[PDB]
Each structure stands twice: as C-alpha cells, then as structure tokens.
Design a protein around this nucleic acid. Sequence first.
RNA 1: CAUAUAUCCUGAGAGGUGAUGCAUAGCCGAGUGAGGCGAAUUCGGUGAUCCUAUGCUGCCGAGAAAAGCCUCUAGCGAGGAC
RNA 2: UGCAUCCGGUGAAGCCGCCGAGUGAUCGAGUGGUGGAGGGUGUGGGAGUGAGAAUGCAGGCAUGAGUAGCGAUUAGGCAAGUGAGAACCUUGCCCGCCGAAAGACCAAGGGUUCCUGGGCCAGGCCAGUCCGCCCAGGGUGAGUCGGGACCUAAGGCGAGGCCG
RNA 3: GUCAACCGAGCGUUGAUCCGAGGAUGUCCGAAUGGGGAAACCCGGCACGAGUGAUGUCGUGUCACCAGGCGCUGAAUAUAUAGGCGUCUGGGGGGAACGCGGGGAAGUGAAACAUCUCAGUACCCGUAGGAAGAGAAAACAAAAUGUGAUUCCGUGAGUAGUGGCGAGCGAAAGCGGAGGAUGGCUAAACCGUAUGCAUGUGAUACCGGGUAGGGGUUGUGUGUGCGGGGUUGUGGGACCUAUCUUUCCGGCUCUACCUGGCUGGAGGGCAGUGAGAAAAUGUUGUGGUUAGCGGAAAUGGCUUGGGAUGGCCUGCCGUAGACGGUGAGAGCCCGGUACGUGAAAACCCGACGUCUGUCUUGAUGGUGUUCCCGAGUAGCAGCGGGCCCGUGGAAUCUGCUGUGAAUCUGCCGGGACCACCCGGUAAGCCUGAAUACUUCCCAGUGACCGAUAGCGGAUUAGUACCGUGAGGGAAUGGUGAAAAGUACCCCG
Lengths: 77, 64, 97
Amino acid sequence: SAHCQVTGRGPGFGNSVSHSHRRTPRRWDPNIQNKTYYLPSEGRRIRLRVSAKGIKVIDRDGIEAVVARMRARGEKY
Amino acid sequence: GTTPGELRELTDDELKDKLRESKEELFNLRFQMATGQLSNNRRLRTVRQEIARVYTVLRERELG
Amino acid sequence: ATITDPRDIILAPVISEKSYGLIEDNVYTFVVHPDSNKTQIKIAIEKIFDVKVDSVNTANRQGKRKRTRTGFGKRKSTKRAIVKLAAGSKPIDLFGA
RNA sequence: CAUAUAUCCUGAGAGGUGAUGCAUAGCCGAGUGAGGCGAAUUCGGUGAUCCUAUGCUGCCGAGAAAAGCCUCUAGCGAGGAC
RNA sequence: UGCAUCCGGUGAAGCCGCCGAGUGAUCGAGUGGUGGAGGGUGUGGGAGUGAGAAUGCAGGCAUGAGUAGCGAUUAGGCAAGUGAGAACCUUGCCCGCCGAAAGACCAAGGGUUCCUGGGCCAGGCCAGUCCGCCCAGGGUGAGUCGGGACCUAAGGCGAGGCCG
RNA sequence: GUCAACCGAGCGUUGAUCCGAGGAUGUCCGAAUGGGGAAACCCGGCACGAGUGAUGUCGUGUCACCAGGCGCUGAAUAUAUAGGCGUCUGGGGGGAACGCGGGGAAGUGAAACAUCUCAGUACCCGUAGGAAGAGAAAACAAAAUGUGAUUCCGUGAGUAGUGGCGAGCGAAAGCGGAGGAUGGCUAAACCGUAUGCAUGUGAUACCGGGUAGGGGUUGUGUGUGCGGGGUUGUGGGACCUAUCUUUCCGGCUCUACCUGGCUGGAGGGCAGUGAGAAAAUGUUGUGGUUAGCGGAAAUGGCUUGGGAUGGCCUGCCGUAGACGGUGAGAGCCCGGUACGUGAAAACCCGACGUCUGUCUUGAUGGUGUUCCCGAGUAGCAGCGGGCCCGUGGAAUCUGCUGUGAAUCUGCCGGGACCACCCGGUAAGCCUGAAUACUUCCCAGUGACCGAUAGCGGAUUAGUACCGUGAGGGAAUGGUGAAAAGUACCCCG
C-alpha cells in the first residue's frame, strides 16, 4: 500500500488455519483510511493515510505534534 | 633538442612559438613519410615528445 | 592550454594512380581525421597553403579484414578528402609527388 | 449584382528555345586499343496497365494526424521592402 | 612416500626380443637391439590402487568399397593460343537455351566478395594454367539521389503524478 | 613490450632501457546526467575566446533528475498555501563471498499421501560494514546467603521432551573457556529562559525575608525550542530543611543594604579526536608498508665423455648444505639464501606540543510529607508467526485489527492460575575485543595433478563454432647443449 504515515503499521504475513492445515498466508493489512484534517497554523486542509489507531493518536495528542513527528521521518506528505 | 629546465626559462608566448613550429614540422614529416622522402623516422617520436613537454609545462604554469 | 592547430586534422597525402591523374588537372587528395567536416577542411587548407579552395568532398572507407593463425583481424577506417583548387592554381609543393 | 464559354484558379500535352551543341549510321588507315571527319534527321498509322486524374460518375462498408502554404490579429516596431 | 643401503651418460627407465623360472596373480640383480636420465632392494605408512562388455567417453584405423554417387528436366563442338601438364582457361567461327527471364535497376541482408599483379600442396564433388579460393596493392567523391538536421499515425519511453 | 623474425633509422656514462610513490593529459559509450539514441553515434543552447569581407565552422567551459537547507513570489482566495525562479550540499551505479530485517517454493523422505519433512534451504527484495547484528538486565536461579552486559566455541544432549507419539525434529539452565568496558548518554517531576495560540484582578501581585519608587521581571494561563538539575533498585530523584561547609574579584538576586542564587574572567585539574563534541595544526620513531643492495669458500688433480655439475683422490667456507639454472646429480660457477643494510616523497600506527572543551559557585551526610520515574503503550479478547512445544492445561517473545491502566502499599516475570516470598525496574538511544569471509595483493608449503589429468582455459580460450536469444562451449604442450634450420650438385 502507499504505507501508513504516522506510526508505520505495515502489513504482516499469516499462514495456516484450522480443520487440518494447508499452509497459506493472507497478509494481515492494517486499516488505513483517507481521513482529512485542517491545519489552523498554516491555514490548510491535509489528507493523510492513517489508521483508526492513528486517528486515536491524533485526537488525544494533536495534529501539529504529528506532522512534526512525521517531518522527522521525512515522509513526503 | 631541448629539456624542461631549459624550457622553463622561456615565457608562454615563446613556448607557443615553438609549439606551432613543431607541429608544422610534424606535418611536413608525415607528408615526407608518405612520399618516401624520409629516412630518419625517429624525428616523429622526438617531435611528439617535445609537444607533450610543452603542453605539460603550460599546465604546470596554470595549476601552480 | 589547448591550441587549435589546423595541421593536426590533415594527417597525410594519398599516393596512387588515381591521385596523380587528379593532380595532372589540379585536384589533391588528403587523409583527414574522421570527426572533421568540409568547412573545417576547407579552412585548414586555404589557411595552410594560402591558396583558394572552392569545393571540397569526402569519403569513408571501411577497413579490410585479414586473417591470421589467431583469427579475423581488421584494419582501420579513415576519411579521404578531395579538394579542387580554384583558378588560383599554385600547386602544393610540400606534396613532393 | 449574378449565368456570361464573362473573370479567376488549376492543368495533360502540341509548338519555340533548351541545342551553332551533343550523338548517331557509317568510312579511313590503325591495330593493345588508340583514334579523327561524321550525311539525312520528314511524314502517316497503331497504341499503353502511363499523364490530366487527390479529376468525374455511382454505391455503402461512409473512408489518419501533424508539419508545411496562405491569411487575421497579439507583439517586436524606425528603420528598412522589393 | 619415512628410514637403510645398491646400480646408473663405462648408458637407468620405456619399448621389441631371445633364453629361462614360478602351483597362480606373475617373474627375470639373465642376457641382445633401440633409446637417452633416473631407478631397485627390505621394512613400515597411504591409495584417484588392477577393465572385456555400461545401445559407455575422446582420438586413431578397418569391413561395406575402390561399390553407390558427382546436385535436373539447355547441348556442346573444331582450329589456334600460352602452359611442365588442357574435354573444361583466353580468342575465332559454328551450334543450342531463357527472352513478364535464366535479361537491365533499387530496398532489406551480407561485408571486400569489386579492379590490377602474382599464385596454384588447402578448398571447388574429377583435373585445372582457372575461380566469389590465397597474398599484397588499389578502389567507393552528392546543396538537388535514399534517409537526419522538417512533421506526425500504430506503438514505445515517460518529468511530475496515481496506485502498489 | 611480445607471439616474432626481417629491414630501416637511432639513442645512451651528460647515467639510457628498467622499478617504485605522486601529478598532468585523459577521444566516444556506460549510473550517463544538455536533448535524443538501434551502446560506443546524431542534433543543439548559453558565456568567453580563436577565425571569414558576413554567415557557416572551431576551441574552453557549463545546462538532467530527485531529497534537504537558504533566498524571491503566494495562483484560484481572504489568511496563506501547493507550485514557480536562483543558489549550496548530498544521493543515483558496480562488486567474489561474509551480515542483518522481510518475502519464500518444489522435486525428495514418510516405501502412497494432504498435516509434517526436505528448508525458513535455493531464489527475490531493501540496505550495510570492514566486519556486521545483539548488548547493559522489567535476566537466570532456588531458598544455596548464589550468579552478575552481550556474542562466538566445548559439554550438557541426540538427553528432558515434541511428534498423523509415524518419518523424524530437538533445546535451555548449568559447567569449563577466549575477551573484558561489572560501559556511557537522555526524557519527566522542578527552575531560568526566548517565545507562540489566549486573555486582561487590568492589581496586592511578579522576588530572599525587611526598609521600597514604580504599577506589572505581563497578572494569571498553555504547548513549543534553549539552558540547568536529574539517571537509580537495598529504590532513586525534584520539592523541603539543619550541619561541616577543601580559591580572588567583575557584575548581577528588578532594584541601594545582611544573607541565599546566577551571570563573567582567572590560576588550576580532568579528558579529547574516544561509544561518551568536534575540525585542522607542526614537531614526530631506524616505527611499519610502497623500489632495492652487499653477502663467506676449489680455473684443484687422474679418467670417462660432444660437454663433468659424475666416479676416485686431494682442500676450503659455514649466524649461509633452502631452492633453481648453468651442455650429464654443483655447499665453493651463476642467481640467491643465513645475516645486516636502505627511503627524497606518499600512506598507516602512536607520540607529542597546538586546538578543542570540561569540572571548577563545592561536597558529604541528615529529617517529615506532596510531586516524577519514558502511553494509544503494557494488559485482556479474535485470527497468526516462531520459540523442544503441530492448539494443547500452554507461560515468556511477538505481527494486524478492536478495546484499553496506573507511578513505588506501583508494575513485569519465577511454564496455566491464585495467595506468600524472590529477582528486576519495560515501552529513548549509542557501545569496542573475542567471531565469520576473500574479487584483488605479497611470501611460501605439499606422502596434490603433470597435457584424454589439473581451473572450462600450460597452446589466440569464455576465444572459434552452435543458437535469433538468455545461454552453451571445444581441440592443439616437448627438435637439439646453441639454429650450427641442410650452403653446393643431380632428378623433378
């Protein structure tokens, strides 16, 4: 995928099941979405690819904080 | 017949004088060599070397 | 430094029956550098000999391919240039036939 | 205002020049092959799958684009146009 | 190969042998020819350690065999020629074949095969003075030809970009 | 230079050929990077310079892409932004193995086979380094008064165990060892700060009490960036508050005065290119590497032989009888060895003095309570990976979703779980040495091969030849001591 942006919750690769096994993965994706937000600092609307988890992070942590944390990682937002 | 310390007395424009002269000599030698009017083949080598020395001295004087 | 000399392009004459039949009527064939061209050769010649060129030509030659105990070698290509001096008509002395 | 073979455009070809030249039948000895002079050069028929023809006529299956050419201004504009 | 000793350009090995031996695998420190520099013996050590067969591998040579063939349905010939040597090579006069091709000109493709001089131990399905064979030298010239510097179709690559 | 001769013409004691380190030049393709392109070939721009009567031409440079920093502008559109223009630094690809993270098979074995195994191997991806990764206890252990970062080796152990309890897989603790740095740096409570989004007791508050001008060191909030303080487990730390209180002063604590606390310089100490901040400096070691050089002793005698380096007999050297070559086995012929020498320049080690900081304005202990001890995390549930462990009673370690806590009577572990005791203090970060590996380079060894062997390649070898293409992929060593390679004649 375009890859998460605030955390880095990438995929994973499972395998087997019950009822006798069979070996066979099925990526365990993450739940990213395309929520947008508003930066009152620079007067702008930003769209991101963020999981619901990361939305939780935002609403109990801020957006400025998050973009600074992403600036660190230098994601091409 | 020259050497580097001998040439390093000469300023630039003198070096270019000898440079152009030696190229004229090399040209006339190549025509003589084709025609068969040449025996002392080695003058080609000597001239080619002298040209190299002169360019070398110029570059020394431009990187000094 | 670098100094454009015209005498580094023109490499050598040509010596053969065709060339001499041309010289009998004032056409001279030289061997040049492959990356030359006609304006460059014209300028080189009507500088070197201070004589009045009016038309120039060219040609390319793909070198021969000889054999050896080793195997299949190959000589070098060239570029032959052919000059028709105008009515000025001072023949090129340094040629030496 | 217009229907005119007006006017314009396009356009196979016939004609003059191009060409007092070239070149050609042939002749001369000459022998590897060099050579040199060099006549008349009108008239009719026949006939192209070629040219006008990207034309014309008809039909339906309804038939590349851009550069180039011409043109109108924007503008560079006091120097240059043929 | 460890160790001890013996022979060796006054001729080792290897090979061809002759004469002989061992119950056998094998042996000759028994002698000749060839040939030209390392070998033998006793004891122990270690093995890429013994080939006649794998429709076995590599090279060489036989039987078939001096046999079949020598590549179309056009067809060759006589004189002279140089030459060591001529059915074929050069010339002369005949003859015959294709003639919407077996003729003349381009593109792709190949790459000196083109010309001259010399050459014929290899090659050409015979020979060859000949050849697209061999060697050396020579030779391809563009304002207007086919392309580029002029344009675009199918399609390609694809800044940024979007997806993953 | 050479296979590889021949011919021609030359140079060299004025030091050539040759060897080593540094420089210069360095056509075109290639990450290829001005644009383009069928790889090595086509077309240009801009600044300068050369050149023509002017154009054409020529030469020197430079022009791609992105990421970041800085600078100018801020389109729809108001703030203002994306974007656009200029400049500065990076990255871009190749590599023989070795490493870490991720993905990830199958033939095979099971005398069938799917679970399992082969193997988390081959292969693929992303990134490295000279080594990597891991690494300082939220660990082991068992009541022994024990151990004390990690990694790699030996053993434990083919055991306890796991497993269609079938094939088969398979630890750890513990113990002995190599190497030692039982290593350091941060965040938070709390202050001093610039701030930045807010407001206005618009005042009895901003500070050391107090003598006090103001009338706000903005009055109070709140995150941000900087600086102090603080780095622990038997808990520590910040507030608090006594005690001894191991330098001089400059100014500061809003302010003149008594103290407490800062902001400066100075002797000093400590340390340094360290992991713990970072650059260059100049001395500098017969310290090391990159060419080399000297180097002992028999023309010894007789014979053989084409040639003595052989046999036999005479001498010698030996910090040198290793090896090879020389016309046949050479310690005494040659090359060289044992041994000692040798570096203008460059490179590497430390060594220093520069230079840089850094503690110095300080510490040891006391004493009763509030505050802090790394949050979308740890934990629980649902699917899954891997741990001896195939969902089983199945801990610890973990991946995605969903839900979701506290700060020391706190929390995590000691193979479900609960109570007691024990050990330890997660969710921030760096860390050398032991270890693995060889494209290349240097010097040697061999109970390894000796031309159908040995690297596929002793011979033009990844060549010829084959294939459209990826890709396959051969064959051929020996004259003799030295070419003295048969001059000359005869047949042809």
